[PDB]
Amino acid sequence: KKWFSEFSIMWPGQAFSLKIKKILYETKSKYQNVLVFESTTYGKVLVLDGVIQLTEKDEFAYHEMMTHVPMTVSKEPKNVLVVGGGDGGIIRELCKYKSVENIDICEIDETVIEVSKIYFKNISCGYEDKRVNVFIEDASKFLENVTNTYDVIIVDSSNFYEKIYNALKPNGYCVAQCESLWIHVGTIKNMIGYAKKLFKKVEYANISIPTYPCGCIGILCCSKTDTGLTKPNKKLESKEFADLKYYNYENHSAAFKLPAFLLKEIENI
Amino acid sequence: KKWFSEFSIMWPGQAFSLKIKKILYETKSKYQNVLVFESTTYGKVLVLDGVIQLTEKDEFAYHEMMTHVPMTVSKEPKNVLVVGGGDGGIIRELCKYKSVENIDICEIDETVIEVSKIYFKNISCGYEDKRVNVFIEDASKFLENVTNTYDVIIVDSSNFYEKIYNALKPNGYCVAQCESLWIHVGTIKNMIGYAKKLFKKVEYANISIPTYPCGCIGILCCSKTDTGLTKPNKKLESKEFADLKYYNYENHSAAFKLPAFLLKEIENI
């Protein structure tokens, strides 16, 4: 058998590898290289530009935390926007909420959506939901052009934050993927720096997920209210949320309790 | 340059790799292969039987959490035992407490201790402390033979738990390294199973550490009291603890807030 290996100048000096059971699909889209494979122990894997986007084994950690954090804080969210997230995982998580009336997603590369609809049916199933509307578009162009404002914006990717701010309702929230605390602390500082210019409450949380570099990924959290995103305003008690595998009431708050070295870094910002 | 790669049947299908700046030392001791190298981005690395034991970049996460969890719960700990932990990291953390009168460590393989004294001076520095006593011995033999009982036992390695129980004071605590929740859940269930036979409060916590498989490692926590190990009984406010980099009052409790799928597994135990 053969091994997939993940290298990048964003994390030099380290790599993470998964054994390939069999390659399933492979292409060069207009935007990036796309690879799909069955791994031997992590299920199916989606790779974009040689970097793991998701695996079946652990994707719930990232998609549940990214979604249910802001969605339990938002009181009655009606209009939600996903930026990036062609795979549909966040969308699967959003559809669980009955009060949501619309879900927009802006993903630049439709191959990602199409590949995920084909190979990852337990991830991309929210696309069959009538509330969902897909926009094959540059997020920066979508945000400049949009007429609705949103209750929650989830940035599942990677002046921009000026656009996010203007696209949110006066009490709206944004959560964006934001680096591993183990590798890019200067970047975490910069992102928090930018967001604090605009948002009155910027907070950083951490997700345990083995197939992202360093085994974790952070969530930049932006509120317009004084209150912020650390305390849920509801429990996910209905039948739709019975099968959640990572997120729960308590770990919501826990995820914001950061290593001392990080607190020390993000204090004088 | 060349790459070190970490394979094992304990986590098949995955591997983690670090770029080698230069190999520093390499031997086959009576017990295991020992490798030391400077990596390009994680500092010096200690490898035992081809599995990473520690790196300079992130070792504090594991050593601080393993130590300061039970040591902030124990009221006035006087006698402490480390099993394994030849590297000295836990010992460095223990020496910070002024009330501790003795620190015993039982490590079967003195090469580990000697190599760490040479190559990892900011890790093995607690050995120069007068309270520390080294026992080149099999832990199971040490525990059967010991006449003192201990306030805290820290198992920095990997009937045994019957021996740990008997070696602890009536109100003593044990913390043992206990698997990643991402890979060996059956094992976590078994360890908790064994410990609950003996200890009245068994609890599992999670440490974020990038160079262990899956980027995290758990702490099996065993108390004889009803109270347990989730709530510190003190704050580490003195000059000795000013330089802590991971552990703090809040993340102590947070580390016990586990992913829903794990709670579901360890409930009917």
Side-chain angles (χ1 to χ4, degrees), chain B:
Chain B
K1 287 189 176 297
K2 184 64 196 311
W3 288 69
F4 172 76
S5 292
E6 207 199 338
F7 300 92
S8 170
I9 52 156
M10 290 299 96
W11 46 90
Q14 60 185 90
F16 173 70
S17 301
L18 291 171
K19 205 185 205 181
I20 302 163
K21 206 201 182 203
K22 46 210 72 202
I23 300 172
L24 297 174
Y25 175 81
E26 212 162 351
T27 196
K28 195 215 185 294
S29 83
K30 176 186 180 173
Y31 289 102
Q32 65 209 320
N33 290 265
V34 178
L35 160 78
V36 179
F37 68 94
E38 186 81 23
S39 64
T40 51
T41 56
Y42 278 73
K44 272 167 270 154
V45 182
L46 171 59
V47 183
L48 299 182
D49 263 21
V51 168
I52 299 179
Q53 255 287 119
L54 63 80
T55 81
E56 291 183 299
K57 188 191 160 73
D58 66 4
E59 59 81 20
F60 61 84
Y62 176 72
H63 295 138
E64 294 184 11
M65 288 306 289
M66 284 278 286
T67 306
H68 305 307
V69 158
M71 291 290 288
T72 52
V73 169
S74 192
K75 321 260 190 143
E76 256 253 286
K78 293 301 209 303
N79 199 23
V80 181
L81 172 61
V82 184
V83 172
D87 56 75
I90 306 293
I91 284 165
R92 182 195 63 215
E93 295 304 319
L94 292 174
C95 295
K96 303 176 164 164
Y97 295 83
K98 281 147 300 323
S99 85
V100 167
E101 291 175 343
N102 184 243
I103 303 158
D104 291 341
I105 180 193
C106 175
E107 164 54 56
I108 197 163
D109 185 343
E110 85 188 293
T111 319
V112 175
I113 299 178
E114 283 149 354
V115 159
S116 172
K117 274 160 134 171
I118 292 155
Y119 293 106
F120 298 95
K121 294 196 174 289
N122 290 291
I123 301 174
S124 61
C125 55
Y127 280 113
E128 291 176 34
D129 189 276
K130 257 99 172 197
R131 293 171 291 185
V132 173
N133 298 103
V134 179
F135 295 88
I136 303 312
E137 224 189 322
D138 170 48
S140 169
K141 178 157 173 185
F142 183 97
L143 294 172
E144 159 100 343
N145 278 6
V146 69
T147 71
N148 300 75
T149 52
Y150 299 91
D151 288 309
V152 172
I153 295 175
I154 294 169
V155 179
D156 177 7
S157 157
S158 221
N159 207 339
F160 186 69
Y161 282 91
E162 304 198 38
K163 278 155 205 130
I164 297 282
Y165 180 93
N166 295 149
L168 285 166
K169 304 230 178 74
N171 58 333
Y173 306 92
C174 178
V175 305
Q177 188 201 103
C178 197
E179 306 296 328
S180 172
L181 55 92
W182 285 113
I183 36 194
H184 281 295
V185 179
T187 309
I188 298 175
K189 287 174 79 185
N190 292 349
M191 287 308 103
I192 292 170
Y194 300 160
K196 279 201 170 173
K197 247 63 152 66
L198 298 146
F199 293 86
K200 103 170 292 289
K201 205 40 160 293
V202 184
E203 289 157 328
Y204 183 99
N206 188 57
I207 316 167
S208 175
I209 175 139
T211 61
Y212 287 154
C214 302
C216 71
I217 186 69
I219 320 169
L220 188 64
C221 298
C222 309
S223 322
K224 299 198 192 181
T225 50
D226 322 66
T227 43
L229 284 153
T230 74
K231 295 184 182 183
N233 284 319
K234 68 200 83 151
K235 297 192 178 202
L236 304 176
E237 296 172 335
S238 55
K239 70 185 183 187
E240 294 84 9
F241 303 93
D243 71 346
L244 289 177
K245 289 151 140 217
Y246 187 103
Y247 177 98
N248 66 28
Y249 184 68
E250 311 216 290
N251 55 58
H252 180 137
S253 315
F256 293 84
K257 302 311 177 184
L258 301 166
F261 81 80
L262 179 53
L263 293 179
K264 196 209 162 200
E265 278 282 61
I266 65 179
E267 86 197 343
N268 280 317
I269 299 177

Side-chain angles (χ1 to χ4, degrees), chain A residues 67-187:
Chain A
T67 306
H68 305 307
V69 158
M71 291 290 288
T72 52
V73 169
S74 192
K75 321 260 190 143
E76 256 253 286
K78 293 301 209 303
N79 199 23
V80 181
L81 172 61
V82 184
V83 172
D87 56 75
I90 306 293
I91 284 165
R92 182 195 63 215
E93 295 304 319
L94 292 174
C95 295
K96 303 176 164 164
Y97 295 83
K98 281 147 300 323
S99 85
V100 167
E101 291 175 343
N102 184 243
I103 303 158
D104 291 341
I105 180 193
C106 175
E107 164 54 56
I108 197 163
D109 185 343
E110 85 188 293
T111 319
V112 175
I113 299 178
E114 283 149 354
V115 159
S116 172
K117 274 160 134 171
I118 292 155
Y119 293 106
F120 298 95
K121 294 196 174 289
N122 290 291
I123 301 174
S124 61
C125 55
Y127 280 113
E128 291 176 34
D129 189 276
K130 257 99 172 197
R131 293 171 291 185
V132 173
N133 298 103
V134 179
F135 295 88
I136 303 312
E137 224 189 322
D138 170 48
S140 169
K141 178 157 173 185
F142 183 97
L143 294 172
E144 159 100 343
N145 278 6
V146 69
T147 71
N148 300 75
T149 52
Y150 299 91
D151 288 309
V152 172
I153 295 175
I154 294 169
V155 179
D156 177 7
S157 157
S158 221
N159 207 339
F160 186 69
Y161 282 91
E162 304 198 38
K163 278 155 205 130
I164 297 282
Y165 180 93
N166 295 149
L168 285 166
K169 304 230 178 74
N171 58 333
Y173 306 92
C174 178
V175 305
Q177 188 201 103
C178 197
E179 306 296 328
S180 172
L181 55 92
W182 285 113
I183 36 194
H184 281 295
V185 179
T187 309

Side-chain angles (χ1 to χ4, degrees), chain A residues 16-55:
Chain A
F16 173 70
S17 301
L18 291 171
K19 205 185 205 181
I20 302 163
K21 206 201 182 203
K22 46 210 72 202
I23 300 172
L24 297 174
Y25 175 81
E26 212 162 351
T27 196
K28 195 215 185 294
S29 83
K30 176 186 180 173
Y31 289 102
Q32 65 209 320
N33 290 265
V34 178
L35 160 78
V36 179
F37 68 94
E38 186 81 23
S39 64
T40 51
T41 56
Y42 278 73
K44 272 167 270 154
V45 182
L46 171 59
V47 183
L48 299 182
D49 263 21
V51 168
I52 299 179
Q53 255 287 119
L54 63 80
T55 81

